Structure formats: C-alpha cells, structure tokens
Amino acid sequence: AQSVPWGISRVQAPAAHNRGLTGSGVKVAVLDTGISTHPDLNIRGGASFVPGEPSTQDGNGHGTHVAGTIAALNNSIGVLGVAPNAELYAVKVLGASGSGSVSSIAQGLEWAGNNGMHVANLSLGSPSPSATLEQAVNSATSRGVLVVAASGNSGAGSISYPARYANAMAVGATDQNNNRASFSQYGAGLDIVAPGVNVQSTYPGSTYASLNGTSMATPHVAGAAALVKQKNPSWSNVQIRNHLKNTATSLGSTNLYGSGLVNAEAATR
Ligand SMILES: [Ca+2]
Ligand SMILES: [Ca+2]
Numbered sequence: 714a715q716s717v718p719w720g721i722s723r724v725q726a727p728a729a730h731n732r733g734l735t736g737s738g739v740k741v742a743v744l745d746t747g748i749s750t751h752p753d754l755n756i757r758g759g760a761s762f763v764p765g766e767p768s769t770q771d772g773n774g775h776g777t778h779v780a781g782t783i784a785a786l787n788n789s790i791g792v793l794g795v796a797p798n799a800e801l802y803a804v805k806v807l808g809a810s811g812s813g814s815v816s817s818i819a820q821g822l823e824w825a826g827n828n829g830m831h832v833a834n835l836s837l838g839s840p841s842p843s844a845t846l847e848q849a850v851n852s853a854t855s856r857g858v859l860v861v862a863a864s865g866n867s868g869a870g871s872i873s874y875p876a877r878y879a880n881a882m883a884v885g886a887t888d889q890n891n892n893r894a895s896f897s898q899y900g901a902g903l904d905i906v907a908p909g910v911n912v913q914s915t916y917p918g919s920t921y922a923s924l925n926g927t928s929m930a931t932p933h934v935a936g937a938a939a940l941v942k943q944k945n946p947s948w949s950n951v952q953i954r955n956h957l958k959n960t961a962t963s964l965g966s967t968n969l970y971g972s973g974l975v976n977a978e979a980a981t982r
Pocket of ligand 1: 715753785786787788789790791792793
C-alpha cells in the first residue's frame with residue numbers, strides 16, 4: 714500500500730496529479746549526499762564531486778530522503794513525491810559524513826547547468842557567504858536552472874548561503890499547524906515555505922524514515938516547480954519562481970514566511 718505523506722497533501726500535489734501534472738519531462742538534480750537505489754525511486758543518472766566516493770549511492774540517507782519528497786514513484790508501495798514522473802539525477806556534492814566543500818557544490822551546479830537540468834535542489838547551506846558558490850549559483854541560473862535552497866535550521870532571523878543569494882529561491886519550513894517551525898531560518902531573501910516537520914520519505918536500505926528540517930521543506934518546492942514547468946514548458950526559471958510565489962498561500966509576515974506556503978494546486982491552474 715502507498716501512503717501520501719502529510720506535506721505532499723499539504724502542498725496539494727494530488728490536485729495537480731489529477732490534472733495530468735506529474736513532472737514528466739522535467740529534469741531535477743538533487744545536490745546532496747547521493748541517492749540510493751530504492752524501489753520507490755527512478756534515478757536517471759548523476760555524478761559525484763566527492764573525492765573518495767566516486768559512486769552516486771547515498772552513504773548518509775539525507776539525499777535519498779530529499780529525492781523521495783520530490784519524486785517518489787506513484788505506484789502501490791512506499792510513498793508519493795510532489796512530481797512522481799520527474800527525471801531524477803543524483804548529484805553527490807556532500808560525503809557520507811553529510812558535509813562537503815563549496816568546491817564540490819560549485820562543480821555540481823556547473824554540472825547541472827551543463828546537463829540541462831531544469832531544477833536544482835540544494836538542501837544544504839552555510840551561515841558564511843562564498844564567492845565560488847555565488848558564481849556557480851549565478852552561472853546555473855543563466856543556463857536556465859531554477860536553484861532552490863534551504864533557509865537553514867538555526868532558527869535565526871537571517872538565512873543561509875546560498876539561499877540568501879538573489880538567484881536562489883530560499884525555502885523555509887512550516888509545521889502541521891501552518892506555523893513556522895522553530896528551527897526554520899527567516900528574514901531577508903526568504904522566498905517561500907513548505908512542510909518541514911515529521912516528513913516521511915524514502916531512505917536507504919529500501920525503507921522509509923521521517924526527518925525534520927528546512928532540507929525537507931525545499932524538495933516540496935523543487936517538486937512544485939517541476940509540475941509548473943510541465944504545464945508551461947516555455948517558462949524560464951524566473952517565470953516559474955515568480956508564479957510559485959504569486960500563488961502561495963499567505964501565512965502571515967513575509968519576514969517569517971516570504972510569499973507563504975507553496976500551493977501546487979493554485980500553481981498548476
Ligand atoms: Ca510509491
Ligand atoms: Ca533568496
């Protein structure tokens with residue numbers, strides 16, 4: 714039996730799937746710890762920029778978790794992603810330890826822009842700005858990639874890099890009450906929010922696990938962007954990014970929530 718995690722239904726993904734929108738033909742790169750082979754995922758390709766782990770398989774579990782929120786297959790097992798037909802690429806920029814260098818992250822973004830990815834999911838971040846990173850963000854953007862990044866889990870009133878950069882779409886996390894989760898960073902540069910508490914998804918060892926973090930909120934928006942792209946194949950990263958914002962549900966302060974909760978129902982109309 715397949716269950717639909719609460720955040721998937723919170724963002725109204727099923728409403729989009731009932732219209733024929735599942736992310737089919739949209740390429741999404743997950744820059745993280747890798748993606749393990751899983752029966753509820755279809756991994757199309759990828760690369761590792763982690764010296765010492767040439768493989769794209771996930772030794773941490775974080776990337777596999779992220780990937781399942783975007784694109785867990787719509788079938789009779791496990792869970793269901795926001796864009797279950799998206800073409801998934803495993804871009805390994807963090808090691809098993811769950812950390813990596815800006816150098817690896819920059820290479821992964823370059824890779825994405827060279828391989829015609831539509832959306833890049835960066836569920837990672839630093840409190841410190843990086844010129845290398847910023848340049849990579851900007852270069853992927855001008856190659857048509859929509860970069861989506863987590864605001865960070867420090868709970869502070871400023872957001873992480875690269876989500877802080879203008880060309881990154883910064884995602885914070887809400888709870889089941891539609892409140893900002895305590896750990897979700899907010900402040901200037903924050904674009905939108907999505908479910909981030911108790912998120913159930915695919916996990917290595919062919920299983921499922923629930924995690925919390927802005928890292929879990931991000932993939933709901935990457936997924937929502939694939940739905941929109943499928944519906945409006947001619948739209949640019951910018952067009953997609955503003956439509957998501959314009960159609961999000963207001964939750965109170967733009968300081969704490971940016972544009973509001975992403976809404977894939979309102980967006981694919
Ligand atoms: Ca499934
Ligand atoms: Ca931003």
